[PDB]
Design a protein around this ligand. Structure first.
Ligand code: HEM
Ligand code: HEM
Ligand SMILES: CC(C)(C)OC(=O)N[C@H](CSC[C@@H](Nc1ccccc1)C(=O)NCc1cccnc1)Cc1ccccc1
Ligand SMILES: CC(C)(C)OC(=O)N[C@H](CSC[C@@H](Nc1ccccc1)C(=O)NCc1cccnc1)Cc1ccccc1
Lengths: 439, 439
């Protein structure tokens, strides 16, 4: 390279192979690679995704500098992603000024008031979620959580943002490590693939929407995007935000729900202690409300501690858009700065027994011993997760309604312990199946 | 180029643009381009798909030389197709020796005896095809032919080759001009896309089968591929033939059926004259049989004359694998030789009133005035359509059973006349909808 950079900076790290960089080390997944490098190299280290240098940082102050103090000036954008096509205008993917604009356009969607307007609406699909669960529990047949969870998550996302109601067991649309591997050795092929219309998003899954958002409709977040469009928001740019929002609210929601239900099943005392709180705040199986959801502290602790063990983003990243010297360390233009959330969430130098599910970690007696720059399931700074309050609410409303009616036990075919997918993303190897018993 | 070749051979043709070749001329579709060049240039002409020279030939003798006399020696293979992936081992796509082998392996599937074994089996889905039609005709609601036709075509293909029965209105699997355009200017990008696993066949449609043929099953054409495997046939090569066969039997069958039913609807005398023959050969709505299907001469004439107007392959092609001088014309190595079937099927120098639907053209009084090297809906020579006798049978069995119960009239929203898709393939612009009346 270009494989001399960290050598030259005196920054330690795994020796890269030509072209490949360190990427063969991903044979155990991002997260094990990160954990290993943390323990081998300490607070800071560098590696190469192909020819791209990545600096991992683990100092809280330095992380606050990157995500917060110097965001607009230096660390505004994430690693180039391609080929994306018209999805370049998607907010999680857009850069500099354009992202600032979309962030401004879309921010007022998750105010405490717009959220609070959605609790009445969400309250309907929880009842479908239960009734669907009530059938596969009267029939003692183990249940695939992500199926009925994603169906619920799908139902919430299409109607909180657009207005479309579907009982996701008609199986309505749904979209979807062989190839992104070739990206990292061949990032030069991204501009190639762009001119080919080639997309990591199959052109058919997007064409299903390239009209279906125009096919919505029309005369909620979709409302809020024309009402704020009234330098304003295009319509192929509006479709792009819709795609982001539908994915995020479907996949992350369903998947974190599956993780929580696994933890409750292998820790029955935590499941019961939570069911008792729900019944004390919502007695007679009372319907949750925006304000009772926010009152349940143990539900929050359970949500948080699961997100400690399964930070589904895994890593946070920012591109260095110019030479800087943050907290005494020189960082050259073009380096990707990465925060290894999975690794920091499991660091024994911050967390007692860091692999155990222990929600007391987030008790108000203990929540202050926790550095918001070590615990980052939603990122931080101006580019943190815009859907955070919606996600926590949506999940908690789901959990409340579900633990109000059912208990969850392991099955013969439950994977205990749970292996993580040694692949690209943060999911289990085998899917989560548990016995569901009616209260 | 390389854009001097035809200039140098004294062969006439449209002047190519740099890089693009003649490809902007496709703005009206292959078929109009071919027809135009035929009338402008005569019997032989050349053009460039990007930098690739294509020689069109229209002399019957020369066409017989190419497709028949010199097939194994010179004109064994079709234009390189990519990126294909494991689909390179598919018979329509494979080359030289390997194609010879697969052609030998797979040929005995459509013997008159293996076909005859399938008439009993096919006879079941025709009855589903009718009963499905009987519902949308008791409800005077116009019908989309290709929907119920493809459902039938799907049902026939999965069970004639594997053994799987599905009432294709549960909507069972089904797989599927933006990008192949970039191929022709960038064929150099094909080896690029191969190393990227990138496929013109979405990796998910094939993964749905990359196991589903292994998921078939196992302890018919699928039978005949292990029984002949017993230099033998692999299993990822077996999947590849399955994919070819499922497509061909689904899409071509459904689409030619739609074309025939359009012609019968806009020519009611032909529809009646056919219904009379079916009732004379199969009286009391008798079930068709292998031998009665072959007896109906007007049904054959109707099938043939539709295939004259809609040759769904459009063009036949062979790569020149070495310098030759066929019928007095020198052809250099690497040129694609193309036979413009659509253009020859509509040549007024061979066909009276060539745009009219006139099935008498194929009467036994007139069928001999027709050059099998001008009329080529199934290609010709050792690389002709291997599924021809199956296709004609399958369609004719469908037509018999359907015209035995229903008549077909135009609708308010029937496109008359029918526009062809000015796009890539030979399909109508709008889909075919007709009124269906119960006899
Ligand atoms: C449990 C659920 C979720 C988790 C753990 C999560 C986590 C994250 C993380 C870690 C980031 C990157 C933050 C950073 O770089 O500092 C992010 C960004 C983002 N998230 Fe989420 N997320 C969740 C659900 C959602 C939902 C439901 C939406 C709804 C639209 C959403 C929308 C976004 C967007 C648009 C971004 C990019 C923000 C920007 O660049 O301005 N997320 N999320
Ligand atoms: C109305 C229906 C069909 C029409 C008009 C049609 C037409 C054609 C044509 C024009 C060719 C190229 C011949 C050449 O280059 O000389 C071809 C090849 C082929 N057809 Fe069909 N076809 C039909 C249905 C089918 C079906 C149902 C199958 C079932 C598997 C099939 C299998 C194939 C294969 C495998 C090839 C490549 C043959 C080889 O290279 O050895 N076709 N077809
Ligand atoms: C393993 C998971 C998936 C859990 O995580 C990731 O691997 N991470 C993503 C990789 S896909 C980029 C894009 N997906 C997309 C998906 C479909 C059609 C177009 C686009 C995205 O931005 N999605 C929003 C999001 C996802 C998750 C949480 N919240 C918000 C990168 C990313 C994550 C978070 C914020 C920004 C970017
Ligand atoms: C407009 C139409 C489609 C009617 O026609 C074409 O454009 N023609 C094809 C282009 S796709 C090559 C491949 N499809 C495929 C489709 C899906 C998964 C993998 C592969 C093929 O070979 N199919 C068999 C076939 C199709 C039609 C008739 N009979 C047999 C080229 C071709 C045609 C005929 C023989 C060989 C090659």
């Amino acid at each position: 390279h270009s494989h001399g950079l960290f050598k030259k900076l005196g920054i330690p790290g795994p020796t890269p192979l030509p072209f490949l960089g360190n990427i063969l080390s991903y044979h155990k997944g991002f997260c094990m690679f990160d954990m290993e490098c943390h323990k081998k190299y300490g607070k800071v280290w560098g590696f190469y995704d192909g020819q791209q240098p990545v600096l991992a940082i683990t100092d809280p102050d330095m992380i606050k500098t990157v995500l917060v103090k110097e965001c607009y000036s230096v660390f505004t954008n994430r690693r180039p992603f391609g080929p994306v096509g018209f999805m370049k205008s998607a907010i999680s993917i857009a850069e500099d000024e354009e992202w600032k604009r979309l962030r401004s356009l879309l921010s007022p969607t998750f105010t405490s008031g717009k959220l609070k307007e959605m609790v009445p609406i969400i309250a309907q699909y929880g009842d479908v979620l239960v009734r669907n669960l009530r059938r596969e529990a009267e029939t003692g047949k183990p249940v695939t959580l992500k199926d009925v969870f994603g169906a619920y998550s799908m139902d919430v996302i299409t109607s909180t943002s657009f207005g479309v109601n579907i009982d996701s067991l008609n199986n309505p649309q749904d979209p979807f490590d062989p190839f992104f591997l070739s990206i990292t050795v061949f990032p030069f092929l991204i501009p190639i693939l762009e001119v080919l219309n080639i997309c990591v998003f199959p052109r058919e899954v997007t064409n299903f929407l390239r009209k279906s958002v125009k096919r919505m409709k029309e005369s909620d977040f979709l409302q809020l995007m024309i009402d704020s469009q009234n330098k304003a928001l295009s319509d192929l740019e509006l479709v792009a935000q819709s795609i982001i929002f539908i994915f995020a609210g479907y996949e992350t929601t369903s998947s974190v729900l599956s993780f929580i239900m696994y933890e409750l099943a292998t820790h029955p005392d935590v499941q019961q202690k939570l069911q008792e709180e729900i019944d004390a705040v919502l007695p007679n199986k009372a319907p949750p409300t925006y304000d009772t959801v926010l009152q349940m502290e143990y539900l929050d602790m359970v949500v948080n501690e699961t997100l400690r063990l399964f930070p589904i983003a895994m890593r946070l990243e920012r591109v260095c858009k110019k030479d800087v010297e943050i907290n005494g360390m020189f960082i050259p233009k073009g380096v990707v700065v990465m925060i290894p959330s999975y690794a920091l969430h499991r660091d024994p130098k911050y967390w007692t027994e860091p692999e155990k599910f222990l929600p007391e970690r987030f008790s108000k007696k203990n929540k202050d011993n926790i550095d918001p720059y070590i615990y980052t399931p939603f990122g931080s700074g101006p580019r943190n997760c815009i859907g955070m309050r919606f996600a926590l609410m949506n999940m908690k409303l789901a959990l409340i309604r579900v633990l109000q009616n059912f208990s969850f036990k392991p099955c013969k075919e439950t994977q205990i312990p749970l292996k993580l997918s040694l692949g690209g993303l943060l999911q289990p190897e085998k899917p989560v199946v548990l016995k569901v018993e009616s209260r």
